[PDB]
Amino acid sequence: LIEVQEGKAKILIPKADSPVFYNPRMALNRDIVVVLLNILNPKIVLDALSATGIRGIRFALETPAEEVWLNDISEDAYELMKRNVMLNFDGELRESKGRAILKGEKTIVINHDDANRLMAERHRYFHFIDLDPFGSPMEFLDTALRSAKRRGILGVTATDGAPLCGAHPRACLRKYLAVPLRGELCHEVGTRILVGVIARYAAKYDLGIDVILAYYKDHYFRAFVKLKDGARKGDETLEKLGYIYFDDKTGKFELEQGFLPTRPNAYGPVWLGPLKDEKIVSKMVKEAESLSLARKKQALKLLKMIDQELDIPLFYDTHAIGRRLKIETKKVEEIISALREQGYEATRTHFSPTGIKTSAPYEVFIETIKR
Ligand SMILES: C[S@@+](CCC(N)C(=O)[O-])C[C@@H]1OC(n2cnc3c(N)ncnc32)C(O)[C@@H]1O
């Protein structure tokens, strides 16, 4: 059992297969949540699957959250959670039947249980829930949508890019109830599928969603959504769903808005609405800068890219399109400059190193990239 530090938190992690899971590479993902929570200010928050407890501990130490819940089904994780919490906080941790509570400046609740059972007990209780599972979050989604306030925030992660990026089509249909698209656009389609499944599951509770921030990074998808209260809110949310058509011979895509597609070879359903709230993401860049984070340089690099990134469905991948059409292409920076000079919005995208988001028609893009 060695000690490590992440952000303002110091935790004990076992040494190697490990009894309690901890991934230092996820320090960035945790930094982004911290930044967002300092903008939204949720009071009651839940770290549904905390393992070592690092996420919830940082929520308590680095954000305005007043009541923080840490939960894990593993006995080992639970014991480690209590230890690391008391490693960062003073006081006596009162425990009773797989539940330990500390009532200090911040109220910390440590629970040993199935996330679905805990969330079912806390109906319409949390202002913010963070679902960070090992793989798919689908077995916890429906209950999280009932555990969060009707105007709460949901932070969702999916680490199984295989089905979301199209490698495992069958699994994607089973888990996400959507037809995935392979290729250069898969990182974004996977992200829009995640957001779209959250929107679809939310509808039955007469709730809609506004995406605060949804992105892809190092083989995992993240979606922060704000629940909207009302049947009409839910109707308008479903109206933002749609499908994608992809011509594998050219890289040209088409979009169809609607609950159901009306042509063959449709991919989706996917969320065709905004993948970010401009104002909030803009504020996150500033907030990240004024905060001490675990991976501050990587967090700013990602947030700045997303901040300047055009918020529009899909993009054109210079490399992939070049390979499909069998043509030579210009460099990305040369293409963006050329597109802007012609009056079209054009930016790079975090979804791909060679991707370009632009309002320009496919044909205009092709004429511009042709070298
Ligand atoms: C990759 S880890 C989570 C990490 C994290 N939240 C962070 O930033 O370190 C997911 C894990 O979820 C678990 N788990 C699996 N099923 C669960 C369930 N039904 N309820 C609560 N926890 C569960 C674990 O035992 C384990 O600690």
Short mmCIF file of C-alpha atoms in Angstrom, two decimals, residues 15-358:
data_model
loop_
_atom_site.label_atom_id
_atom_site.label_comp_id
_atom_site.label_asym_id
_atom_site.label_seq_id
_atom_site.Cartn_x
_atom_site.Cartn_y
_atom_site.Cartn_z
CA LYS A 15 0.77 -2.04 -4.86
CA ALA A 16 0.70 -4.79 -7.50
CA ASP A 17 -4.70 -7.57 -10.27
CA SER A 18 -4.95 -4.86 -7.62
CA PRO A 19 -7.58 -5.13 -4.82
CA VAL A 20 -8.71 -1.52 -5.38
CA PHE A 21 -8.53 0.15 -8.79
CA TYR A 22 -6.74 3.44 -9.44
CA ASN A 23 -5.67 4.92 -12.78
CA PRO A 24 -3.36 7.97 -12.65
CA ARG A 25 -4.14 8.62 -16.31
CA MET A 26 -7.70 9.46 -15.21
CA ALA A 27 -6.33 12.39 -13.21
CA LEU A 28 -7.17 14.55 -16.23
CA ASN A 29 -10.77 13.32 -16.36
CA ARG A 30 -11.04 14.10 -12.65
CA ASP A 31 -9.51 17.56 -13.17
CA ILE A 32 -12.20 18.42 -15.74
CA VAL A 33 -14.99 17.46 -13.35
CA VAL A 34 -13.40 19.57 -10.60
CA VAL A 35 -13.26 22.60 -12.91
CA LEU A 36 -16.90 22.16 -13.98
CA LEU A 37 -18.14 21.75 -10.42
CA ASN A 38 -16.48 25.05 -9.52
CA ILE A 39 -18.60 26.69 -12.23
CA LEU A 40 -21.93 24.95 -11.56
CA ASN A 41 -21.61 24.75 -7.75
CA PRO A 42 -23.65 21.58 -7.09
CA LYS A 43 -24.34 21.14 -3.34
CA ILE A 44 -25.11 17.42 -2.97
CA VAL A 45 -22.92 15.20 -5.15
CA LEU A 46 -22.40 11.48 -5.70
CA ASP A 47 -19.33 9.52 -6.78
CA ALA A 48 -21.28 6.31 -7.62
CA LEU A 49 -18.26 4.00 -8.14
CA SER A 50 -15.30 5.52 -6.29
CA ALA A 51 -12.84 2.63 -5.81
CA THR A 52 -10.12 4.41 -3.80
CA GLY A 53 -12.42 7.38 -3.26
CA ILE A 54 -10.13 9.81 -5.09
CA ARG A 55 -12.90 11.41 -7.15
CA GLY A 56 -15.21 12.13 -4.21
CA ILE A 57 -12.30 13.20 -2.01
CA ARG A 58 -11.25 15.76 -4.61
CA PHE A 59 -14.88 16.88 -4.99
CA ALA A 60 -14.85 17.63 -1.25
CA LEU A 61 -11.39 19.26 -1.24
CA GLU A 62 -11.45 21.18 -4.52
CA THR A 63 -15.08 22.19 -5.16
CA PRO A 64 -18.02 23.99 -3.48
CA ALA A 65 -19.92 20.72 -2.93
CA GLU A 66 -21.23 20.60 0.66
CA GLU A 67 -22.29 16.96 0.92
CA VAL A 68 -20.21 14.31 -0.82
CA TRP A 69 -21.19 10.67 -1.19
CA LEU A 70 -18.62 7.96 -1.98
CA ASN A 71 -19.83 4.50 -2.94
CA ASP A 72 -18.46 1.12 -4.02
CA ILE A 73 -19.71 -2.44 -3.92
CA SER A 74 -16.26 -3.80 -3.06
CA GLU A 75 -15.49 -4.40 0.61
CA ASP A 76 -11.82 -3.64 -0.07
CA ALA A 77 -12.63 -0.41 -1.87
CA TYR A 78 -14.94 0.61 0.98
CA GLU A 79 -12.26 0.11 3.64
CA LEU A 80 -9.72 2.04 1.55
CA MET A 81 -12.27 4.82 0.99
CA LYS A 82 -12.70 5.36 4.74
CA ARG A 83 -8.94 5.38 5.21
CA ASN A 84 -8.18 7.88 2.44
CA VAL A 85 -11.02 10.17 3.51
CA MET A 86 -9.65 10.29 7.05
CA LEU A 87 -6.25 10.86 5.49
CA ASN A 88 -7.50 14.18 4.08
CA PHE A 89 -10.00 15.15 6.78
CA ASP A 90 -9.93 15.39 10.58
CA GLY A 91 -12.63 14.25 12.98
CA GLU A 92 -14.22 10.93 13.88
CA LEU A 93 -15.85 8.86 11.14
CA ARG A 94 -19.03 7.35 12.61
CA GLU A 95 -19.76 3.97 11.01
CA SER A 96 -22.84 1.75 11.00
CA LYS A 97 -23.55 -1.16 8.63
CA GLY A 98 -21.47 -0.39 5.55
CA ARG A 99 -22.04 3.34 5.95
CA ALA A 100 -19.61 5.86 7.48
CA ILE A 101 -20.31 9.57 7.89
CA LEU A 102 -18.22 12.61 8.78
CA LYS A 103 -20.07 15.83 9.61
CA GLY A 104 -17.42 18.54 9.25
CA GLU A 105 -17.25 21.63 7.05
CA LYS A 106 -18.05 19.16 4.29
CA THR A 107 -20.36 16.24 5.02
CA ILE A 108 -18.84 13.05 3.64
CA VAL A 109 -20.85 9.87 3.29
CA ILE A 110 -19.02 6.63 2.55
CA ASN A 111 -21.19 3.74 1.45
CA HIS A 112 -20.56 0.04 0.77
CA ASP A 113 -23.26 -1.03 -1.68
CA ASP A 114 -24.52 -1.56 -5.21
CA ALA A 115 -24.62 1.87 -6.88
CA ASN A 116 -28.09 1.00 -8.21
CA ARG A 117 -29.35 0.25 -4.70
CA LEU A 118 -27.94 3.46 -3.21
CA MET A 119 -29.28 5.65 -6.03
CA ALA A 120 -32.72 4.00 -5.76
CA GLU A 121 -32.77 4.88 -2.05
CA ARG A 122 -31.76 8.50 -2.82
CA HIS A 123 -34.61 9.33 -5.21
CA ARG A 124 -34.38 12.84 -6.69
CA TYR A 125 -31.61 13.70 -4.23
CA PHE A 126 -28.33 14.64 -5.91
CA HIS A 127 -27.52 17.90 -7.69
CA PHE A 128 -24.70 16.03 -9.41
CA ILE A 129 -23.92 12.37 -10.05
CA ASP A 130 -20.70 11.11 -11.58
CA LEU A 131 -20.86 7.67 -13.17
CA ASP A 132 -17.32 6.45 -13.82
CA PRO A 133 -17.47 2.67 -14.37
CA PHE A 134 -14.97 0.20 -15.76
CA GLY A 135 -16.50 -0.13 -19.21
CA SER A 136 -20.14 0.72 -19.90
CA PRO A 137 -22.30 2.90 -17.61
CA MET A 138 -25.57 1.57 -19.05
CA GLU A 139 -26.47 -0.69 -16.10
CA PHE A 140 -26.52 2.42 -13.86
CA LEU A 141 -27.95 5.07 -16.19
CA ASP A 142 -31.67 4.61 -15.64
CA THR A 143 -31.36 4.70 -11.85
CA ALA A 144 -29.04 7.72 -11.99
CA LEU A 145 -31.73 9.51 -13.99
CA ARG A 146 -34.09 8.97 -11.04
CA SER A 147 -31.58 9.67 -8.27
CA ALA A 148 -30.59 13.06 -9.65
CA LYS A 149 -32.81 16.11 -9.09
CA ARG A 150 -35.09 16.90 -12.05
CA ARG A 151 -32.69 19.78 -12.71
CA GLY A 152 -29.55 17.96 -11.64
CA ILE A 153 -26.35 17.32 -13.53
CA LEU A 154 -25.16 13.98 -14.76
CA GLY A 155 -21.53 13.23 -15.45
CA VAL A 156 -21.27 10.06 -17.50
CA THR A 157 -18.25 8.09 -18.68
CA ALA A 158 -17.93 5.16 -21.06
CA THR A 159 -14.58 3.42 -21.49
CA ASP A 160 -15.62 0.77 -24.00
CA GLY A 161 -14.84 2.44 -27.29
CA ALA A 162 -15.00 -0.91 -29.07
CA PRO A 163 -18.80 -0.85 -29.36
CA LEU A 164 -19.06 2.96 -29.45
CA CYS A 165 -16.48 3.33 -32.24
CA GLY A 166 -18.00 0.49 -34.24
CA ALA A 167 -15.56 -2.40 -33.71
CA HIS A 168 -18.22 -4.37 -31.79
CA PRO A 169 -21.47 -3.48 -33.65
CA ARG A 170 -23.61 -6.15 -31.97
CA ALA A 171 -22.55 -5.05 -28.50
CA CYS A 172 -23.28 -1.42 -29.38
CA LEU A 173 -26.86 -2.25 -30.31
CA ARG A 174 -27.34 -4.22 -27.10
CA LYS A 175 -25.83 -1.61 -24.78
CA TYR A 176 -26.60 1.68 -26.53
CA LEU A 177 -29.50 0.76 -28.82
CA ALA A 178 -27.77 2.51 -31.72
CA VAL A 179 -25.99 1.48 -34.93
CA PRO A 180 -22.32 2.61 -34.66
CA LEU A 181 -20.20 4.09 -37.46
CA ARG A 182 -16.59 2.96 -37.89
CA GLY A 183 -13.86 5.15 -39.34
CA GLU A 184 -12.48 8.67 -38.92
CA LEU A 185 -15.75 9.95 -37.41
CA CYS A 186 -16.17 7.23 -34.77
CA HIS A 187 -14.84 9.24 -31.83
CA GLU A 188 -17.56 11.85 -32.35
CA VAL A 189 -20.33 9.43 -33.35
CA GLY A 190 -19.54 7.42 -30.23
CA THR A 191 -19.83 10.60 -28.15
CA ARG A 192 -23.15 11.53 -29.80
CA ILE A 193 -24.44 7.99 -29.22
CA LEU A 194 -23.66 8.28 -25.51
CA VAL A 195 -25.43 11.65 -25.26
CA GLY A 196 -28.30 10.33 -27.35
CA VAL A 197 -28.87 7.28 -25.15
CA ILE A 198 -28.94 9.48 -22.05
CA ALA A 199 -31.53 11.70 -23.76
CA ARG A 200 -33.68 8.72 -24.76
CA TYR A 201 -33.66 7.12 -21.29
CA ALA A 202 -34.41 10.48 -19.69
CA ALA A 203 -37.55 11.14 -21.74
CA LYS A 204 -39.86 8.74 -19.90
CA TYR A 205 -39.45 10.76 -16.69
CA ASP A 206 -40.65 13.84 -18.58
CA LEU A 207 -37.10 15.21 -18.60
CA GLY A 208 -35.00 16.71 -21.37
CA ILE A 209 -31.29 17.49 -21.49
CA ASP A 210 -28.91 20.32 -22.35
CA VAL A 211 -25.37 19.18 -23.00
CA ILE A 212 -22.95 21.14 -20.84
CA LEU A 213 -19.88 19.41 -22.25
CA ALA A 214 -19.36 16.12 -24.08
CA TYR A 215 -16.00 15.02 -25.42
CA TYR A 216 -13.72 12.15 -26.34
CA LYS A 217 -10.23 11.63 -24.95
CA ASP A 218 -7.73 8.77 -24.97
CA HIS A 219 -10.25 5.99 -25.66
CA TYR A 220 -13.01 7.05 -23.26
CA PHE A 221 -16.14 9.14 -23.71
CA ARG A 222 -17.42 11.79 -21.30
CA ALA A 223 -20.81 13.48 -21.20
CA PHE A 224 -21.92 16.17 -18.79
CA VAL A 225 -25.63 16.88 -19.08
CA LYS A 226 -28.09 19.19 -17.39
CA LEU A 227 -31.54 17.69 -16.86
CA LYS A 228 -34.50 19.82 -17.96
CA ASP A 229 -37.78 19.41 -16.07
CA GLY A 230 -40.92 18.98 -18.17
CA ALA A 231 -42.74 16.88 -20.78
CA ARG A 232 -42.21 19.54 -23.47
CA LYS A 233 -38.54 19.71 -22.48
CA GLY A 234 -38.38 15.97 -23.15
CA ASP A 235 -40.20 16.37 -26.46
CA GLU A 236 -37.76 19.05 -27.65
CA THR A 237 -34.83 16.90 -26.52
CA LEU A 238 -35.96 13.92 -28.59
CA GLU A 239 -36.40 16.31 -31.52
CA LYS A 240 -32.64 16.84 -31.46
CA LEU A 241 -31.92 13.16 -32.09
CA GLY A 242 -31.08 12.08 -35.61
CA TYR A 243 -29.16 9.80 -37.93
CA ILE A 244 -26.01 9.91 -40.02
CA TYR A 245 -25.42 8.58 -43.53
CA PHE A 246 -21.84 7.93 -44.60
CA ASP A 247 -20.51 7.31 -48.10
CA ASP A 248 -17.42 5.16 -47.59
CA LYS A 249 -16.20 5.93 -51.11
CA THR A 250 -15.88 9.68 -50.49
CA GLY A 251 -16.10 10.39 -46.76
CA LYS A 252 -19.15 12.55 -47.34
CA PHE A 253 -21.75 12.45 -44.58
CA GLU A 254 -25.41 13.45 -44.54
CA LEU A 255 -27.61 14.32 -41.57
CA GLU A 256 -31.24 13.48 -40.91
CA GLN A 257 -33.07 14.96 -37.96
CA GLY A 258 -35.88 12.88 -36.51
CA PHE A 259 -36.67 10.04 -34.13
CA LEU A 260 -36.47 7.54 -37.00
CA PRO A 261 -34.38 7.47 -40.21
CA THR A 262 -36.13 7.35 -43.58
CA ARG A 263 -33.35 5.95 -45.76
CA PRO A 264 -31.18 2.82 -45.82
CA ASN A 265 -27.77 2.53 -44.16
CA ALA A 266 -28.49 4.98 -41.36
CA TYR A 267 -26.18 5.20 -38.34
CA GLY A 268 -27.60 6.10 -34.96
CA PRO A 269 -29.69 7.30 -33.34
CA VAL A 270 -27.26 10.00 -32.27
CA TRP A 271 -27.59 13.36 -30.56
CA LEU A 272 -27.42 15.98 -33.33
CA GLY A 273 -27.60 18.89 -30.91
CA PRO A 274 -24.80 20.88 -29.23
CA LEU A 275 -21.93 18.94 -27.68
CA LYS A 276 -21.02 21.91 -25.47
CA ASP A 277 -22.41 24.97 -23.75
CA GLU A 278 -20.14 27.73 -25.15
CA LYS A 279 -20.36 30.05 -22.14
CA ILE A 280 -19.61 27.34 -19.56
CA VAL A 281 -16.69 25.81 -21.46
CA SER A 282 -15.30 29.32 -21.94
CA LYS A 283 -15.52 29.82 -18.16
CA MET A 284 -13.89 26.42 -17.58
CA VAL A 285 -10.75 27.49 -19.44
CA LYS A 286 -10.44 30.50 -17.14
CA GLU A 287 -11.30 28.44 -14.06
CA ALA A 288 -8.80 25.71 -14.93
CA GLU A 289 -6.13 28.39 -15.23
CA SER A 290 -6.83 29.83 -11.76
CA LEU A 291 -6.87 26.38 -10.12
CA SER A 292 -4.15 23.94 -9.14
CA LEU A 293 -4.89 20.68 -10.93
CA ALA A 294 -3.28 17.23 -11.17
CA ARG A 295 -2.59 17.48 -14.92
CA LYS A 296 -2.98 21.21 -15.43
CA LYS A 297 -1.17 21.41 -18.78
CA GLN A 298 -3.14 18.56 -20.37
CA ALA A 299 -6.42 19.91 -18.99
CA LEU A 300 -5.87 23.38 -20.43
CA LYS A 301 -4.73 21.96 -23.76
CA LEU A 302 -7.94 19.93 -23.98
CA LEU A 303 -10.29 22.65 -22.72
CA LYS A 304 -8.79 25.32 -24.99
CA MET A 305 -9.16 23.07 -28.03
CA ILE A 306 -12.78 22.29 -27.13
CA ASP A 307 -13.37 25.97 -26.38
CA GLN A 308 -12.22 27.16 -29.82
CA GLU A 309 -13.68 24.10 -31.52
CA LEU A 310 -16.69 24.69 -33.75
CA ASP A 311 -19.83 23.10 -32.26
CA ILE A 312 -21.36 21.45 -35.32
CA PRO A 313 -22.24 17.83 -36.19
CA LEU A 314 -19.28 15.83 -37.48
CA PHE A 315 -16.23 16.91 -39.46
CA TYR A 316 -14.04 16.15 -42.45
CA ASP A 317 -10.90 14.14 -41.81
CA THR A 318 -8.21 15.32 -44.24
CA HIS A 319 -6.27 12.06 -44.11
CA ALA A 320 -9.22 9.65 -44.38
CA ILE A 321 -10.94 11.60 -47.13
CA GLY A 322 -7.64 11.70 -48.99
CA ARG A 323 -7.42 7.90 -48.79
CA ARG A 324 -11.05 7.33 -49.85
CA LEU A 325 -10.96 9.68 -52.86
CA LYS A 326 -7.36 8.71 -53.68
CA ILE A 327 -6.14 12.31 -53.86
CA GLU A 328 -3.24 14.22 -52.33
CA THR A 329 -4.20 16.81 -49.71
CA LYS A 330 -2.84 20.01 -48.19
CA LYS A 331 -1.88 20.46 -44.55
CA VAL A 332 -4.59 21.08 -41.95
CA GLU A 333 -3.49 24.64 -41.13
CA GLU A 334 -3.41 25.51 -44.84
CA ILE A 335 -6.93 24.14 -45.32
CA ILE A 336 -8.40 26.01 -42.35
CA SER A 337 -6.85 29.29 -43.47
CA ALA A 338 -8.14 28.74 -47.01
CA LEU A 339 -11.67 27.94 -45.78
CA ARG A 340 -11.81 31.04 -43.58
CA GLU A 341 -10.66 33.27 -46.45
CA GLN A 342 -13.70 32.07 -48.42
CA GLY A 343 -16.04 33.03 -45.59
CA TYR A 344 -16.52 29.66 -43.88
CA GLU A 345 -16.11 28.82 -40.21
CA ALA A 346 -13.32 26.27 -39.80
CA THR A 347 -11.41 24.91 -36.82
CA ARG A 348 -9.45 21.85 -35.75
CA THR A 349 -11.19 19.26 -33.55
CA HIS A 350 -10.24 17.24 -30.46
CA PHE A 351 -11.96 14.18 -31.99
CA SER A 352 -9.11 13.72 -34.48
CA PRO A 353 -5.65 15.20 -35.25
CA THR A 354 -6.45 15.56 -38.97
CA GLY A 355 -10.09 16.52 -38.58
CA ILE A 356 -11.58 19.85 -39.61
CA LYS A 357 -14.99 21.11 -38.52
CA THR A 358 -16.46 23.55 -40.99
#
